[PDB]
């Protein structure tokens, strides 16, 4: 697996930091203190779906109407090869 | 008695006779010993020495 997203990089790093903070690790030599184990760690470091926005925000408008954007994006993508063909065939003139 | 005398004759030795080797089973003769399964290459010996499974817990 390879990381190409920084929020996830940071979150996993944060989990590791919490874990290293949250454990105590015995020596190899011993003296074996009383540990009083936990049955699971998924409970204490639960997978946590993150926030995307607080409930409240102000409105702003842009006059694009949010449907024409999608429509002409569709149009540009489906006619990209032909517009490139037009550009190239006028470019290679003389 | 003759068996015990022969054991004391063949004592402390390798290749003692067939009806005084153990009988256990065909498979549990034709198979690996304690030492021979504990035999393991020096690479993984170093591995298990340097990075062994540590005894940890979670409160803090």
Curated annotation (Swiss-Prot), chain A:
Positions of transmembrane segments: none
Residue numbers of Phosphothreonine PTMs: 44, 52
Subcellular location: Cytoplasm
Task of the protein: Component of the ribosome, a large ribonucleoprotein complex responsible for the synthesis of proteins in the cell. The small ribosomal subunit (SSU) binds messenger RNAs (mRNAs) and translates the encoded message by selecting cognate aminoacyl-transfer RNA (tRNA) molecules. The large subunit (LSU) contains the ribosomal catalytic site termed the peptidyl transferase center (PTC), which catalyzes the formation of peptide bonds, thereby polymerizing the amino acids delivered by tRNAs into a polypeptide chain.
Similarity comment text for this entry: Belongs to the eukaryotic ribosomal protein eL13 family.
Subunit structure: Component of the large ribosomal subunit (LSU). Mature yeast ribosomes consist of a small (40S) and a large (60S) subunit. The 40S small subunit contains 1 molecule of ribosomal RNA (18S rRNA) and 33 different proteins (encoded by 57 genes). The large 60S subunit contains 3 rRNA molecules (25S, 5.8S and 5S rRNA) and 46 different proteins (encoded by 81 genes).
Something else known: Present with 133000 molecules/cell in log phase SD medium.
Name recorded for this polypeptide: Large ribosomal subunit protein eL13A
Organism in which the protein naturally occurs: Saccharomyces cerevisiae (strain ATCC 204508 / S288c)
Source lineage: Eukaryota, Fungi, Dikarya, Ascomycota, Saccharomycotina
Swiss-Prot record, chain B:
Keyword Cytoplasm recorded: yes
Superkingdom of this protein's organism: Eukaryota
Gene Ontology MF terms: mRNA binding; structural constituent of ribosome
Localization terms from the record: Cytoplasm
Family per record: Belongs to the universal ribosomal protein uL29 family.
Extra remark beyond the main annotation: There are 2 genes for uL29 in yeast.
This protein's name: Large ribosomal subunit protein uL29A
Part of the whole protein covered: 61 to 120 of 120
């Amino acid at each position: 697996r390879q990381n190409r997203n920084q929020e996830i990089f940071d979150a996993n790093v944060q989990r590791l930091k919490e874990y290293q903070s949250k454990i105590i690790v015995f020596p190899r030599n011993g003296k074996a203190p009383e540990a009083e184990q936990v049955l699971s760690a998924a409970a204490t470091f639960p997978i946590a779906q993150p926030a995307t926005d607080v409930e409240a925000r102000a409105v702003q408008d842009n006059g694009e109407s949010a449907f024409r954007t999608l429509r002409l994006a569709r149009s540009e993508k489906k006619f990209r090869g032909i517009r490139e063909k037009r550009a190239r065939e006028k470019a290679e003139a003389e | 008695q003759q068996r015990e005398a022969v054991r004391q004759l063949y004592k402390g030795k390798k290749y003692q006779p067939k009806d005084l080797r153990a009988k256990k089973t065909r498979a549990l003769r034709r198979a690996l010993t304690k030492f021979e399964a504990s035999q393991v290459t020096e690479k993984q010996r170093k591995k298990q020495i340097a990075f062994p499974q540590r005894k940890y817990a979670i409160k803090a």
